[PDB]
């Protein structure tokens, strides 16, 4: 069952064994992934998050971000700890009360405190469109058509040893999968389809790190949505999906009744599918209950290439059709050395006072805001360009901007910009050495918006800045409830 748009959401510790290995976790709604939060476009979400965490090994504070939702006028509800709020302390609750005007698509929610979402606090968030322009492309779109891709670790996120390479221990598809080492034949997820029907599969990367090469043996996938943005139909046979991205694709159940492997190959961790790792099962109604016997091709015929995506709507690109053709054109120097990432020479370390509270308390320029050098002001009502040249270790880095989606004027692995009809999205791979992935957006959403690599380990190691968008209108735009105002004093008192 989906929950919302008005719902409680309990955050608890529990043991889970999604790949046959038991470990404690941080869960929303008692499950991994958490329950799907859903509503319709324009709805008022009121998600009362109950922090019932007691195991300090995964942090007993929490804060939840609603990934991809713009939070216009509700910056305080965005969730990134020490950017828009202090964490919720254990035994307390907090009502994230916001609206979703002008958005409809596939989103997700996750802890936004430290690396806590890796420990399990992640789930889908769907804003349905009663008049979806893509509605006539499919027959079924419901909780059974959401596909989550997750990395899963046997070591707790706070306990990953300093200086050891972090890699996952399993890929989980809809919460189930098999471990890369000491593989046991634990249950695989089954996605069931009826021959002849067409399904809106909502593919959600809830990854903390790896990108996945996602495919379904025997089937093609017609992309119709990218990170909440409706796209023209683009048929592919493989999707490389980076952390935090979403796609909807139409799956036409047009193959012989049978079982077909669903594949999600991460870029690190276990390679291949031995023992049924990196796998789930697409089962047609009437098929025998047994594992697929299909194989992947050696080479996919039509992998997704981001430049092939185009918005369904005439979204264009703001600004002028050349590099620097913006009101505020930025080029960030993204670097890694010695275990720390930096942006323009500053490694992000969260401040004591949330950025939003600093602004509300009177800090009125970015030089007043902490962390020093980590907060960049953006002028209001302006076209922003941000070039994100890659090269920093650990890539490809999926950069994500809160509060906004953006035109992807230049994509990974292709030096040619597109000032005409690029896809808009909210999380973008910045590609490889020499690339110059570049985004554009207009600043019509006052508040401090995080920009960071969505590889959670990289965020934790400093790969972030805050855009303090329209500082002058931030307080007026984002009236705060008393309960928000109460968070920092409670947090700081609890220590
Ligand atoms: C990525 O594109 C940006 C522009 O969007 C390039 O930035 C320019 O860099 C040149 C030379 O380094 C400067 O003289 C310009 O002033 C920069 N433009 C802006 C808006 O600052 C950048 O060089 C490109 N990077 C890569 C690696 O191709
Ligand atoms: C590299 O990216 C460019 C820009 O997005 C792609 O160029 C577009 O190609 C389409 C499809 O042929 C044309 O209709 C557009 O006119 C092109 N736009 C520009 C600005 O050149 C190009 O296809 C991408 N390369 C690959 C190999 O996919
Ligand atoms: Cu996110
Ligand atoms: Cu986000
Ligand atoms: Cu990264
Ligand atoms: Cu974030
Ligand atoms: Na334009």
UniProtKB/TrEMBL annotation:
Cu(2+) 1 binds at residues 65, 400. Cu(2+) 3 binds at residues 112, 402, 452. One of its GO terms (cellular component) is extracellular region. It is found in: Secreted. Disulfide bonds join 86-488, 118-208. InterPro entries: Cu-oxidase-like_N, Cu-oxidase_2nd, Cu-oxidase_C, Cu-oxidase_fam, Cu_oxidase_CS, Cupredoxin. PROSITE patterns: MULTICOPPER_OXIDASE1. GO terms for biological process: lignin catabolic process. Its EC number is 1.10.3.2. The keyword ATP-binding does not apply. Cu(2+) 4 binds at residues 397, 453, 458. SUPFAM superfamilies: Cupredoxins. The keyword Signal applies. Its main location: secreted. Cu(2+) 2 binds at residues 67, 110, 454. Keywords: Copper, Disulfide bond, Glycoprotein, Lignin degradation, Metal-binding, Oxidoreductase, Repeat, Secreted, Signal. Pfam families: Cu-oxidase (PF00394), Cu-oxidase_2 (PF07731), Cu-oxidase_3 (PF07732). GO terms for molecular function: copper ion binding; hydroquinone:oxygen oxidoreductase activity. Belongs to the multicopper oxidase family. This is laccase. It comes from Metuloidea murashkinskyi.
């Amino acid at each position: 069952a989906q929950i919302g748009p008005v719902t409680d959401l309990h955050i608890t510790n529990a043991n889970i064994s999604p790949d046959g290995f038991s470990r404690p976790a941080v869960l929303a709604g008692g499950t991994f992934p958490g329950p799907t939060i859903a509503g319709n476009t324009g709805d008022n979400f009121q998600i009362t998050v109950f922090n019932d965490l007691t195991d300090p090994s995964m942090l007993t504070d929490t804060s939840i971000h609603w990934h991809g939702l713009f939070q216009k006028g509700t910056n305080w509800a965005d969730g990134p700890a020490f950017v828009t709020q202090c964490p919720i302390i254990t035994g307390q609750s907090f009502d994230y009360n916001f609206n979703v005007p002008g958005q409809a698509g596939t989103f997700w929610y996750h802890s936004h405190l430290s690396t806590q979402y890796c420990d399990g606090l992640r789930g889908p968030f769907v804003v349905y469109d009663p008049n979806d322009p893509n509605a006539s492309l499919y027959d079924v779109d419901d909780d059974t058509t959401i596909i989550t891709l997750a990395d899963w670790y046997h070591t707790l996120a706070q306990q990953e040893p300093i200086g050891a390479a972090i890699t996952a221990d399993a890929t989980l598809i809809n919460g189930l999968g098999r471990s890369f080492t000491n593989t046991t034949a634990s249950p695989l997820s089954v996605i069931t389809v009826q021959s002849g029907k067409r399904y809106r599969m909502r593919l959600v990367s809830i990854s903390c790190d790896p990108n996945y090469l996602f495919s379904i043996d025997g089937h093609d996938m017609t992309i119709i949505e990218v990170d909440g943005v409706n796209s023209q139909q683009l048929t592919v046979d493989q999707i490389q999906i980076f952390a935090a991205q979403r796609y909807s694709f139409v799956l036409n159940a047009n193959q012989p009744v049978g079982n077909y492997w669903i594949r999600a190959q991460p870029n690190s961790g276990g390679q291949g599918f031995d023992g049924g790792i990196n796998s789930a099962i697409l089962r047609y109604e009437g098929a025998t209950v047994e594992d697929p016997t299909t194989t992947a091709p050696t080479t996919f015929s039509n992998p997704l290439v981001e430049t092939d995506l185009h918005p369904l709507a005439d979204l264009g690109v703001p600004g002028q059709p050349f590099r620097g053709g913006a009101d505020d054109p930025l080029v960030l120097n993204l670097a890694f050395a010695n275990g720390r990432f930096s942006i323009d020479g500053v490694s992000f370390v969260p401040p004591t006072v949330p950025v939003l509270l600093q602004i509300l308390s009177g800090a009125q320029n970015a030089q007043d805001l902490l962390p020093a050098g980590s907060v960049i002001s953006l002028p209001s009502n302006s076209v922003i360009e941000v070039a994100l040249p890659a090269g920093a270790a650990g890539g490809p880095h999926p950069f994500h901007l809160h509060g906004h989606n953006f035109a992807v004027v230049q994509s990974a692995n292709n030096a040619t910009p597109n000032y005409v009809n690029p896809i808009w999205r909210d999380t973008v791979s910045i590609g490889g050495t020499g690339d110059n992935v570049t985004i554009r957006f207009t600043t019509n959403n006052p508040g401090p918006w995080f920009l960071h690599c969505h590889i959670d380990w990289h965020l934790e190691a400093g790969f972030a800045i805050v855009f303090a968008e329209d500082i002058p209108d931030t307080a007026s735009a984002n009236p705060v409830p008393q309960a928000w105002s109460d968070l920092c004093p409670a947090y700081d008192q609890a220590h």
